[PDB]
Design a protein around this ligand. Structure first.
Ligand SMILES: [Zn+2]
Lengths: 670, 210, 766, 195
C-alpha cells in the first residue's frame, strides 16, 4: 500500500527485493504472502479517491503487481501457491463485491485473465477459478480496467509511431494529440506507462517533440499556427507529468553536450514543486533587457499577428521579466487596470503555456513579498488564470484550458493558502493540507498511530500524514515518539502488530530511521538506568525484533522529500561515534558502536531488563539471518553470550580462520 | 462610594518589622471604610464600575539590575488586595537611608491616568493615594517612567496635590521630609495615630480616632 | 588579542561512551553566572539533563540543577535581570527556574509552559522596554547622562501603567508560537497559535523585538535553498487571555545559491541570529556544507517598500561550530564608528566564530572582516560573550570549559592613558547599570591600578549630587575589587569593606530610633545627633550625652538587647583602632579620616544612652582594673584623635600625649582580635597574563558570621552562605527568629553589603 | 509482569485470548437500547458505577475496548427524554441513599458542554432545531440528578468552568445560566450559600 501510494513509478526490482526481504524476516508462507499482496491492492483500490488516484491504483494492481509476481517466481512450484492464494482470496466475497462496485465490472475476471497471460496461473486453474467466482457472483461506458489494459499497447505503439512525427506530418500529430487531450485519455496513458516502467521514454519523446517545435521554420500563418499548438500540447502534457509523477522522470540523467532541452531547464529553475521554492531574482528569471522590450511591445501590439517566427523558448523565458516590468508599471500607477486586462488577454489567449510561465514567476514573487504588498500581484493571477478568452483560439482550446487550470491549481495552492484567497478555477489535490491548523503535532501522530493499530493496517491518507510528519518534525522526533507509543503497550498481540506496522511506516526513510534507532534511541534506552523498566518482556521482545529487522533491511538496501532532505543533511558520523569494511559509511559505524554497547552490557554486573533485551536482540539476529549484520560483532561476545546463556555461536562468528578458534573454544566449553 | 484606591508601599528592610502593626491599625480599617464590612471570598473582580484597589511597591537602588517598581493591576476585590498586602516580602536595603519615592509616585500617577481613561461613566470620583513609607526620599528625579521622567518628588507631589487626588502618608517613624511632602500635596482650595511614635496624616478617608 | 584565563575540566567523568553527542546550551547572565549543559553520560542520561551554574569568580564550585527535562535541553535564557533562568527542551516543557531563598546555589521552578511533543527551537524573554546606548565619543564628557542614554524603546505588552509584563515567547519546530505572561500574582497565561496558515517546518528560528512592541521571529527550515521567512507577532491581553496576532514580513533567499559557478555547496543553513535582540533589522545567517561555511549579514532597509539586501559575507571558512554575538549596546552610528576606529575601542563590534578546527575568529559586525584570531592549542561547541564583551566563555568537544579574555583594542598596543580611559568607561557603564565588573578586572594590569582608582574618585565627584548618592556602595565595591589587584594597593581593601560595614551599621542604628515626639522639628534625630556631636567637642562622654534629649533615644528593651553583637563590634573596632594608633595594618586609613571617627563618636554616644536604659546591650571589655569606665576612656581618646582631623584643611599629625595614652591601652584593656572581611579566594588576583589556570571541577585550588557578629565554633554545626565577591559568611537561617533585629537582618536577604550574591557553602563533617 | 517471569506469563495469558473471544458479544460497545420508562431493566445494560465499565465474567483477556469506560451508551441514554429510572438502574442508584456518584457527574458536565457547543454552531437557521429541546431536557434531567445529591452542585460548576475556560464558547450562555437558575431557584433554601 505504501508503494502504491507514494511511488507508483518505482522500479519493480526494488519492490521485489523489499518483499523478499520481508518474507525472509518474518517467515511467511507463499500463499499467505500473495494473498496479502492481493488484499492490499484491492483494499487500496476501494479506498482510493475518485479521479487520477483511482486510475493509478487500477494500473498498480492490474499491471505492476502481476509483473512483480513474475519476478518473484524467477527468484524463487509458484503456480500452485498463487492458485492457493487465489482460492484464499475468492473466499472473501464482501471485499470483492465492494471492489466490483467501484470497478463497475467484475475485476477478478480481469485479474485471472491477466495472471494467465503472465503465466503465474495454469489455464485449468484460471477456468475453475472463474467458474467459482461466477457462482459466487450470482448471489455503455468501458470500465477503467479495460481502458488501461488496452491502453498499455497503445502506449507502446504510440511510442513507435510518434518517433517519426507521423512521418513529419504535424497536422496528424495535432489531431492525435488533441484526441489524447480529450477526457481522461492522457491520464490513462500515463498511468499505464508509469505502472509499466515506460514513463521515462514517454517523457523523452514529448521533450524531443518540444525541442523540435521550439524554433520552427520559415512558414506562413497556417503552418506556424500548427507549430505553436504543438508547443502548447507538448508543454502542457509535460507539466502535467512533472506535477503528477514527480520531476525526476523529466530529467535526462546524462546529457552529453550542453544541449539540455528547454523544458528541462524551465522545470529545473522555474516551476514550483512541493519541496521546491524558487528565487524570483535568480539569474534564470533575468535573461536580457533587449528581448524583453521586444516582448512587451509584442504583447502591446495586438493579436501577435507575428506567431510565424517566435522562438517560443525565448518568449517563455522572457515572460517573467515582462510581467515584472508590467507589475512595476502598475505599482507606480503609470498603467491602468484596463490595459492590464489587454496584456493578460494577449498572454493567455493564443498560447496557454505563456500563462503558466507567468504564473510560475508570479507565485515565486508573491511568496517573497510581505502581507500588505501582495494585493496587486494576486489580481494578475486572477486574470492569467481566469476563464477563457474567446473568438481567436487556435484549436483544442477548451481541453488546454482544462489542463492549464489543473496546473495552475497545483502551482498556486500554497501561496493562496498563506492568505485566505479563493481563485476558484472550476478534486485533483486529494491529499493536500492534511494537518489541523493549530494542534501540536504529537497529538496528530499518536491519534493516527492509535487508529492504525486498531484497524490493523495503514491507510493511504495515514501514509500521507505520516510522510508529512516525518518531513516536519524530523527523523529523530518521529522515530522516538512512535517507539514511545510502542513501549507503552502491555499486550503481546498489540505489541507484535505495532512492530509489524512500524517497520512499514519506517520504510519511508529506512536508512535514516535505522541510524536514529540504533544510534540514538536504543543506546539511550540501554544506557539510562531509569529507562530500562520500559524494556520489559512484552514490548521489549517486539522492540528487539523491530531493531533487528531495521538493521538487516538497511544493511542489504525512498521518497522525494527524503531524497531532498538527506541531500540537505550534513553530519560527521566519525565524530558522533568515535569508536574507542569501509567504516566511513555511517551504518557500519552505528552497528559497530551498538555491538560494543551490547558486549559491554553483557559483560557487566547488575543484570536487569536491559540484559534480557540484548539477549533477545542477539537471538533474533541469529534467527533472522540466512547466513551480514553480525560481521561487526566483537569476538568477545562469542565468549560472553553463553556465560549469560550453540547456534548463537555458530551463526554469529562469520567463520574466518581465526573465527573458528573462537567458535571451537565456545562450543566445546559450553 | 466609588473609589480609586492606590497604595504606595516601600518594600525595603525598613518598614519590614513595622508593617504588620501598621496593617492592623491603619491599612486594614481604611480598606474596610472603602469596602463596608471586612472582605471574605465572595468579592468578584470585573465590575468596572465600583471601587478599584491597586498596589505599587517600590525599592531602593540596591536592587541594581532589577526594576524599581512592582505594580499590580487594579482589582475590585478587597480580598485579593488583602492577599497582595500579605504577599509583599520586605527584603531590600543595605547601606542607605533613602528610597525611591519618586518612582512609586510616578507610577501612581500613571495608574490614575489609566483609571481616568477607564471610568467615563463618572467624570470624577474619590481618587485616594496612600504612601506607606519609612524613609526620606532620594534626590534622584524619576527615571523609570514615561511622561513623568526627570521630575523630583516635589513636582510629582504638586501634580498629585492639584487635580484633586487625596494624598495620605502613614509612617511608623516620624520624619520631616514626609511631613513637608504632605503639606505640599494640598488639595486645590483629628488624631488618627493609635501609637504616638507612628506619623499618620490622612487628607482623605476616615480611620477610627485613637 | 586572546588569552585563556582558565580551563576547567571534569575529573574522570568524561569519556562519554556508546551514546552520541548532543548540542549544548550556554548562557551568561548580567550577574556573572554561567548556566550551561554538558554531555556527561555516566550511569544515567540525566547527567545530560543537568544545568550547571558556575559563578565565574569561583569556578571549582559548580552547582548542578537536576532539571526534570525528559528530552535534551535546547535553549537556556537568563532574565533581563540575572534572577531567573528559562530552559526549554525538545517536547515542549519550558521551565522557569528561580532562586530558592535568594541563594545562587538553589534553584527551583514553579512556573512553566508546555506544548507537548513539539520541540522548542527558539526561546526568549519578553522585552521590558529598557534600552540604553553608549556614546564612546563622549567618554570624557564628565557626566553619565552624556555617556549612556536611554533610547525610548517600548515594551511588548504594557499593562495598566508604564509597567511591562514579564513573560516568554517560544517557537516550536512546527509552525507554532507560544507566549506565556506572568502576572504579578502567581498566575500565568499561555497562548499558542500557528505562525502562518501554511504550516511548515521551522528548523532554525530566532526572535528580536522592535520599537512599537512587536516581536519579529525568523524561521528557516535548514535547506539553504528555501527562503528565510519572517513574521511580525503582536501580543495583547483580551480581558482574561493572551492573544497573538501574526503577519508575514518580507522573506529573503540567500546568496551562494545564485552564485551559478558551483551553487550546490553549502546546502545547510546552520545558524540564524539577529544581530541583537531589539535590533530586528539585521540578520546573520550561516550556510554550511560538511567542511566549509559562509556567514552573511542582511538588512531590511526600505526603498517593494521593504526588501532584504546583503551587507557583507565572508569568503570561505571552516565549518562554523558556534556563534556568539555581543551584548554591549554601542551606538553604532558613523561618528562613533570613526572614533572607535581612531581610539581603538573594539568591545561592541565583534562576533566570535568558532570553527571545527581549534581556531576562533573575532570578526567585525558590519563588514565581516576578521579582527583577531585565537588558535586553540577539539572545537568550541558553545560560546558566549560577556555583557561588557571583554571575555568569552566556551564549552569544548570534551568536558573542558574555558574563559578567554579579549583585549579591548584586539591586541594592537595602546598607550596607557587610552587603556585607562577604555576600562574606566566600562567600569562607569557597570556602575550606572548594576552589572558585574569581573571581566574588566581580567584586563586590569597591576601597574595601572592606582591611577585607575584616582580616576574613579574624580568621576565620583562632579556628578549631580543624586548620582553621588546612588553610586556610593557601588564605587566602594569597585574600589575594593580594583585595589585587590596590585601588591602596592592590596593593603587598603580591608578598610573599604569595614567602611561599608560602618555605614551599614551607622544608618541602621540611626534608623532604629523613632522619636516619640517632635522637638526642634525639621531635623530628624540622626541629624540632630550629628549636629550635636559635631558642635560639642567635649572630651567627656557625659557632657555630650547631657545635651542630647535622651528621652527620645528609647527602644523597647527587647531589640535593644538583641543589638548586643553589633554594639560589641562597634566598641571592639574602636578599641582596636586606638590601640593600633602607635604603629600599614587593617586600620591605617581610619586614623586620618575625620568623618568615620565622627561616626564612631556618634555610635559611642548612642551606645552610652542605650546602656543607661538597659545595661545588657553594652559591649564588654575585659578590664585590667575594676574602678574603670572603659567607654568614657575610649571616647576621650577618640575625641582627642578626631579633633585632629575635624579641622579645616588640617592633616594634623597626632601629638605624643595621645600616642602614650594609646600605648597604655593594652595595659588597661585586652585588645581582642578582629575578622577582616575579604578572605580572598578570587581568581583575578591569582591569575597572570600568558598563563592559564587548569582546574578540576569540585577541587578548589576562627570562623565567624560577619554580618550578625556571632562566633561559630571550630567546625560549625549550622550551615552558611558565603558572599561571592567579598567572601563574608553568614549562617543561613536566623538563630533566634523571635529576637531578631529585622531592620538589620532584612537588609542582606538578597545580597551581601558589598553587592555580591549569596552562595550556600557545604558543611565539613570532619 | 515481573522482569524475571516475563514471556512465561504474558504468552500464557495470550493463549486465553480465544476463550475471551468466545465470551464477547461482538459490537457490544455500539449496541444501544430503546429507552422505555417501564422499568424491569434487562441486566445487559448495567454498568459499573465506579468506573463506567461493563461488568465482565471472569478474569480473561477481553478485547481492549471492553476495558474502557462506556461513555457513549450513557450519553445516548441521558440525551433521551424520560430516561430517569433507566440511568438509575444502569448505575445502580437507589434514591434511599445519596452518594455523589462521580462519573455520572462528569458525564452530565460533558453533556452540558456538548449542548453549549451545538448551541454555538448556529442555533439560528432552525428556530426549534433540536437545540432548545435539548436545553429543556437538560434542565429536567440535571434538576433530578443534582437534587437528590447523586451529583453535587459546586464541583459540577467548577468542573464546568474548567471545561469552558479558554474554549471560547459564547453564543448560548443564557441557556446555561437558565439551567443553573433552575438549580439555585430549586434548592437555595436547603443548602448554604457557599455551595
Ligand atoms: Zn560581600
Amino acid at each position: 500500500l505504501l508503494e502504491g501510494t507514494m511511488n507508483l513509478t518505482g522500479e519493480t526490482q526494488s519492490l521485489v527485493e523489499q518483499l523478499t526481504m520481508v518474507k525472509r524476516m518474518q517467515h511467511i508462507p507463499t500463499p499467505l504472502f500473495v494473498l496479502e499482496i492481493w488484499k492490499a491492492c484491492f483494499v487500496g483500490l476501494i479506498e482510493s479517491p475518485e479521479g487520477t488516484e483511482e486510475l493509478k491504483w487500477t494500473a498498480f494492481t492490474f499491471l505492476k503487481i502481476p509483473q512483480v509476481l513474475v519476478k518473484l517466481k524467477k527468484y524463487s512450484d509458484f503456480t500452485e501457491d498463487v492458485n492457493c492464494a487465489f482460492e484464499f482470496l475468492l473466499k472473501l466475497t464482501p471485499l470483492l463485491d465492494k471492489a466490483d462496485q467501484r470497478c463497475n465490472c467484475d475485476c477478478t475476471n480481469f485479474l485471472l485473465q491477466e495472471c494467465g497471460k503472465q503465466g503465474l496461473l495454469s489455464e485449468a486453474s484460471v477456468n475453475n477459478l472463474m467458474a467459482k467466482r461466477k457462482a459466487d457472483r450470482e448471489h455503455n461506458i468501458q470500465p477503467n480496467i479495460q481502458l488501461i489494459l488496452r491502453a498499455e499497447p497503445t502506449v507502446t505503439n504510440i511510442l513507435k509511431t510518434m518517433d517519426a512525427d507521423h512521418s513529419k506530418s504535424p497536422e496528424g500529430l495535432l489531431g492525435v494529440l488533441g484526441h489524447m487531450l480529450s477526457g481522461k485519455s492522457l491520464d490513462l496513458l500515463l498511468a499505464a506507462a508509469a505502472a509499466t516502467g515506460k514513463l521515462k521514454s514517454f517523457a523523452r519523446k514529448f521533450i524531443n517533440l518540444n525541442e523540435f517545435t521550439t524554433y520552427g521554420s520559415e512558414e506562413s500563418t497556417k503552418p506556424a499556427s500548427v507549430r505553436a499548438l504543438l508547443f502548447d500540447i507538448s508543454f502542457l502534457m509535460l507539466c502535467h507529468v512533472a506535477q503528477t509523477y514527480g520531476s525526476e522522470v523529466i530529467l535526462s540523467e546524462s546529457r552529453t553536450g550542453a544541449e539540455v532541452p528547454f523544458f528541462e531547464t524551465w522545470m529545473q529553475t522555474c516551476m514550483p514543486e512541493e519541496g521546491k521554492i524558487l528565487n524570483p531574482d535568480h539569474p534564470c528569471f533575468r535573461p536580457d533587457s533587449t528581448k524583453v522590450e521586444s516582448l512587451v511591445a509584442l504583447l502591446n501590439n495586438s493579436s501577435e499577428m507575428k506567431l510565424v517566427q517566435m522562438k517560443w523558448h525565448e518568449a517563455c523565458l522572457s515572460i517573467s521579466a515582462a510581467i515584472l516590468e508590467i507589475l512595476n508599471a502598475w505599482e507606480n500607477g503609470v498603467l491602468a487596470f484596463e490595459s492590464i486586462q489587454k496584456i493578460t488577454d494577449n498572454i493567455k489567449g493564443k498560447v496557454c503555456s505563456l500563462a503558466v510561465c507567468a504564473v510560475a514567476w508570479l507565485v515565486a514573487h508573491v511568496r517573497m513579498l510581505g502581507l500588505d504588498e501582495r494585493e496587486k500581484s494576486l489580481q494578475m493571477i486572477r486574470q492569467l488564470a481566469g476563464p477563457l478568452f474567446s473568438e481567436n483560439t487556435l484549436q483544442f482550446y477548451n481541453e488546454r484550458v482544462v489542463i492549464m487550470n489543473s496546473i495552475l491549481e497545483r502551482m498556486c495552492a500554497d501561496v493562496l493558502q498563506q492568505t485566505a484567497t479563493q481563485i476558484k478555477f472550476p478534486d485533483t489535490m486529494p491529499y493536500w493540507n492534511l494537518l489541523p491548523p493549530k494542534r501540536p503535532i504529537k497529538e496528530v501522530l499518536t491519534d493516527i498511530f492509535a487508529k492504525v493499530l486498531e484497524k490493523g493496517w495503514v491507510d493511504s491518507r495515514s501514509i500521507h500524514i505520516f510522510d508529512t510528519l516525518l518531513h516536519m518534525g524530523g527523523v529523530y522526533w518521529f522515530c522516538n515518539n512512535l517507539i514511545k507509543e510502542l513501549l507503552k503497550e502491555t499486550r503481546k498481540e498489540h505489541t507484535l502488530r505495532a512492530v509489524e506496522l512500524l517497520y512499514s511506516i519506517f520504510c519511508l526513510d529506512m536508512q535514516q530511521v535505522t541510524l536514529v534507532l540504533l544510534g540514538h534511541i536504543l543506546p539511550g534506552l540501554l544506557t539510562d538506568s531509569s529507562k530500562w523498566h520500559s524494556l520489559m518482556d512484552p514490548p521489549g521482545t517486539a522492540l528487539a525484533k523491530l531493531a533487528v529487522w531495521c538493521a538487516l533491511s538497511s544493511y542489504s538496501s525512498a521518497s522525494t522529500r527524503q531524497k531532498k532532505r538527506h541531500r540537505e543533511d550534513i553530519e560527521d558520523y566519525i565524530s558522533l561515534f568515535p569508536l574507542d569494511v569501509n567504516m566511513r559509511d555511517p551504518l557500519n559505524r552505528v552497528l559497530a558502536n551498538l555491538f560494543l554497547l551490547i558486549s559491554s552490557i553483557l559483560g557487566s554486573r547488575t543484570a536487569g531488563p536491559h540484559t534480557q533485551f540484548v539477549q533477545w536482540f542477539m537471538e533474533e539476529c541469529v534467527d533472522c539471518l540466512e547466513q551480514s549484520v553480525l560481521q561487526f560483532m566483537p569476538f568477545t561476545t562469542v565468549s560472553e553470550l553463553v556465560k549469560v546463556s550453540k547456534v548463537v555461536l555458530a551463526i554469529t562468528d562469520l567463520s574466518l580462520p581465526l573465527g573458528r578458534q573462537v567458535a571451537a573454544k565456545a562450543i566445546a566449553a559450553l | 462610594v466609588v473609589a480609586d484606591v492606590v497604595f504606595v508601599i516601600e518594600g525595603t528592610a525598613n518598614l519590614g518589622p513595622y508593617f504588620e502593626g501598621l496593617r492592623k491599625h491603619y491599612l486594614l480599617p481604611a480598606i474596610e471604610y472603602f469596602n463596608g464590612g471586612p472582605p471574605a471570598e465572595t468579592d468578584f473582580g470585573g465590575d468596572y464600575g465600583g471601587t478599584q484597589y491597586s498596589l505599587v511597591v517600590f525599592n531602593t537602588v540596591d536592587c541594581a539590575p532589577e526594576s524599581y517598581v512592582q505594580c499590580h493591576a487594579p482589582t475590585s476585590s478587597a480580598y485579593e488586595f488583602v492577599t497582595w498586602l500579605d504577599g509583599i516580602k520586605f527584603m531590600g536595603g543595605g547601606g542607605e537611608s533613602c528610597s525611591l519615592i519618586a518612582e512609586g509616585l510616578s507610577t501612581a500617577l500613571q495608574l490614575f491616568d489609566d483609571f481616568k481613561k477607564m471610568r467615563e461613566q463618572i467624570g470624577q470620583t474619590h481618587r485616594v493615594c496612600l504612601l506607606i513609607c519609612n524613609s526620606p526620599p532620594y534626590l534622584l528625579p524619576a527615571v523609570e517612567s514615561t511622561t513623568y521622567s526627570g521630575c523630583t518628588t516635589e513636582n510629582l507631589v504638586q501634580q498629585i496635590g492639584e487635580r484633586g487626588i487625596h494624598f495620605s502618608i502613614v509612617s511608623p517613624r516620624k520624619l520631616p521630609a514626609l511631613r513637608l511632602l504632605f503639606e505640599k500635596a494640598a488639595p486645590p482650595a483629628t488624631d488618627v495615630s493609635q501609637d504616638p511614635r507612628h506619623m499618620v496624616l490622612v487628607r482623605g478617608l476616615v480611620l477610627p480616632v485613637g | 588579542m586572546m588569552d585563556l584565563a582558565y580551563v576547567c575540566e571534569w575529573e574522570k567523568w568524561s569519556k562519554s561512551t556508546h551514546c552520541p553527542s548532543v548540542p549544548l546550551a550556554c548562557a551568561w547572565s548580567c550577574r556573572n553566572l554561567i548556566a550551561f549543559t554538558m554531555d556527561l553520560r555516566s550511569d544515567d542520561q540525566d547527567l545530560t539533563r543537568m544545568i550547571h551554574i558556575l559563578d565565574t569568580e569561583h569556578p571549582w564550585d559548580l552547582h548542578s540543577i537536576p532539571s526534570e527535562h525528559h528530552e535534551a535541553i535546547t535553549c537556556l535564557e537568563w532574565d533581563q535581570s540575572g534572577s531567573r533562568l528559562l530552559s526549554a527542551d525538545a517536547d515542549g516543557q519550558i521551565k522557569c527556574w528561580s532562586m530558592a531563598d535568594h541563594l545562587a546555589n538553589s534553584w527551583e521552578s514553579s512556573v512553566g509552559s508546555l506544548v507537548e511533543g513539539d520541540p522548542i527551537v527558539a526561546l526568549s524573554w519578553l522585552h521590558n522596554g529598557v534600552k540604553l546606548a553608549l556614546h564612546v565619543e563622549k567618554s570624557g564628557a564628565s557626566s553619565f547622562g552624556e555617556k549612556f542614554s536611554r533610547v525610548k524603546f517600548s515594551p511588548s505588552l504594557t499593562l495598566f501603567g508604564g509597567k511591562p509584563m514579564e513573560g516568554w515567547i517560544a517557537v516550536t519546530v512546527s509552525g507554532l508560537v507560544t507566549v506565556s505572561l506572568l502576572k504579578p500574582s502567581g498566575q500565568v497565561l499561555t497562548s499558542t497559535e500557528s505562525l502562518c496558515r501554511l504550516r511548515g517546518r521551522v528548523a532554525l528560528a530566532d526572535i528580536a523585538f522592535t520599537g512599537g512592541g512587536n516581536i519579529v521571529v525568523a524561521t528557516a527550515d535548514g535547506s539553504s535553498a528555501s527562503p528565510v521567512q519572517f513574521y511580525k507577532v503582536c501580543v495583547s491581553v483580551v480581558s482574561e487571555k493572551c492573544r497573538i496576532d501574526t503577519e508575514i514580513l518580507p522573506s529573503l533567499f540567500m546568496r551562494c545559491t545564485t552564485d551559478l559557478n558551483r551553487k550546490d555547496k553549502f546546502p545547510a543553513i546552520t545558524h540564524l541570529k539577529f544581530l541583537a535582540r531589539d535590533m530586528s533589522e539585521q540578520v546573520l545567517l550561516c550556510a554550511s556544507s560538511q567542511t566549509s561555511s559562509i556567514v552573511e549579514c542582511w538588512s531590511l532597509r526600505k526603498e517593494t517598500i521593504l526588501k532584504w539586501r546583503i551587507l557583507s559575507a565572508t569568503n570561505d571558512l571552516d565549518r562554523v561550530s558556534a556563534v556568539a554575538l555581543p551584548k554591549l549596546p554601542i551606538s553604532l552610528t558613523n561618528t562613533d564608528l570613526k572614533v572607535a576606529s581612531d581610539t581603538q575601542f573594539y568591545p561592541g563590534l565583534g562576533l566570535a566564530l568558532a570553527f571545527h578546527d581549534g581556531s576562533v575568529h573575532i570578526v567585525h559586525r558590519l563588514s565581516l572582516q576578521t579582527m583577531a584570531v585565537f588558535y586553540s592549542s577539539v572545537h568550541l561547541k558553545a560560546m558566549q560573550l560577556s555583557w561588557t564583551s571583554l571575555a568569552l566563555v566556551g564549552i569544548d568537544s570534551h568536558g573542558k570549559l574555558s574563559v578567554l579574555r579579549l583585549s579591548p583594542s584586539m591586541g594592537h598596543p595602546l598607550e596607557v592613558g587610552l587603556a585607562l580611559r577604555h576600562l574606566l568607561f566600562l567600569l562607569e557603564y557597570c556602575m550606572v547599570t548594576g552589572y558585574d565588573w569581573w571581566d574588566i578586572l581580567l584586563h586590569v594590569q597591576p601597574s595601572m591600578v592606582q591611577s585607575l582608582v584616582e580616576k574613579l574618585h574624580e568621576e565620583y565627584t562632579r556628578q549631580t549630587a543624586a548620582l553621588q548618592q546612588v553610586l556610593s556602595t557601588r564605587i566602594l565595591a569597585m574600589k575594593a575589587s580594583l585595589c585587590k589587584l596590585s601588591p602596592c594597593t592590596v593593603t587598603r581593601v580591608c578598610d573599604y569593606h569595614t567602611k561599608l560595614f560602618l555605614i551599614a551599621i551607622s544608618s541602621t542604628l540611626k534608623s532604629l530610633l523613632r522619636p516619640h515626639f517632635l522637638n526642634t522639628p525639621d531635623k530628624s534625630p540622626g541629624d540632630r545627633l550629628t549636629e550635636i556631636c559635631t558642635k560639642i567637642t567635649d572630651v567627656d562622654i557625659d557632657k555630650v550625652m547631657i545635651n542630647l534629649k535622651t528621652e527620645e533615644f528609647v527602644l523597647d528593651m527587647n531589640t535593644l538587647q538583641a543589638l548586643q553583637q553589633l554594639l560589641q563590634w562597634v566598641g571592639d573596632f574602636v578599641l582596636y583602632l586606638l590601640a593600633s594608633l602607635p604603629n600599614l595594618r587593617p586600620g591605617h586609613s581610619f586614623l586620618r579620616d575625620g568623618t568615620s571617627l565622627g561616626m564612631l563618636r556618634e555610635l559611642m554616644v548612642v551606645i552610652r544612652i542605650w546602656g543607661l536604659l538597659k545595661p545588657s546591650c553594652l559591649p564588654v571589655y575585659t578590664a585590667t582594673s575594676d574602678t574603670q569606665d572603659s567607654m568614657s576612656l575610649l571616647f576621650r581618646l577618640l575625641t582627642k584623635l578626631w579633633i585632629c582631623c575635624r579641622d579645616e584643611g588640617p592633616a594634623s599629625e597626632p601629638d605624643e600625649a595621645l600616642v602614650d595614652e594609646c600605648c597604655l591601652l593594652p595595659s588597661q584593656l585586652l585588645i581582642p582580635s578582629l575578622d577582616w572581611l575579604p578572605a580572598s579566594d578570587g581568581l583575578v588576583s591569582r591569575l597572570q597574563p600568558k598563563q592559564p589556570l587548569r582546574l578540576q571541577f569540585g577541587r578548589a585550588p576562627p570562623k565567624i558570621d560577619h554580618l550578625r557578629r556571632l562566633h561559630l565554633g571550630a567546625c560549625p554545626t549550622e550551615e552558611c552562605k558565603a558572599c561571592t565577591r567579598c567572601g563574608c559568611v553568614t549562617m543561613l537561617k536566623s538563630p533566634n527568629r523571635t529576637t531578631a533585629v529585622k531592620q538589620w537582618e532584612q537588609r542582606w536577604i538578597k545580597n551581601c553589603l558589598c553587592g555580591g550574591l549569596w552562595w550556600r557553602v557545604p558543611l565539613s563533617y570532619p | 509482569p515481573h522482569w524475571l517471569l516475563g514471556n512465561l506469563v504474558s504468552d500464557f495469558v495470550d493463549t486465553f485470548r480465544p476463550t475471551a473471544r468466545i465470551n464477547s458479544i461482538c459490537g457490544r460497545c455500539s449496541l444501544l437500547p430503546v429507552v422505555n420508562n417501564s422499568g424491569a431493566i434487562c441486566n445487559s445494560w448495567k454498568l459499573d458505577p465506579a468506573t463506567l465499565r461493563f461488568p465482565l465474567k471472569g478474569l480473561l483477556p477481553y478485547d481492549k475496548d471492553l476495558f474502557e469506560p462506556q461513555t457513549a451508551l450513557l450519553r445516548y441514554v441521558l440525551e433521551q427524554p424520560y430516561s430517569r429510572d433507566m440511568v438509575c438502574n444502569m448505575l445502580g442508584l437507589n434514591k434511599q441513599h445519596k452518594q455523589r456518584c462521580p462519573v455520572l457527574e462528569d458525564q452530565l458536565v460533558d453533556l452540558v458542554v456538548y449542548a453549549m457547543e451545538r448551541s454555538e454552531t448556529e442555533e439560528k437557521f432552525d428556530d426549534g432545531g433540536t437545540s432548545q429541546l435539548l436545553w429543556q431536557h437538560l434542565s429536567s434531567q440535571l434538576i433530578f440528578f443534582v437534587l437528590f445529591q447523586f451529583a453535587s452542585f459546586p464541583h459540577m460548576v467548577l468542573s464546568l468552568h474548567q471545561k469552558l475556560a479558554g474554549r471560547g464558547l459564547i453564543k448560548g450562555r443564557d441557556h446555561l445560566m437558565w439551567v443553573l437558575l433552575q438549580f439555585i431557584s430549586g434548592s437555595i433554601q436547603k443548602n448554604a450559600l457557599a455551595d
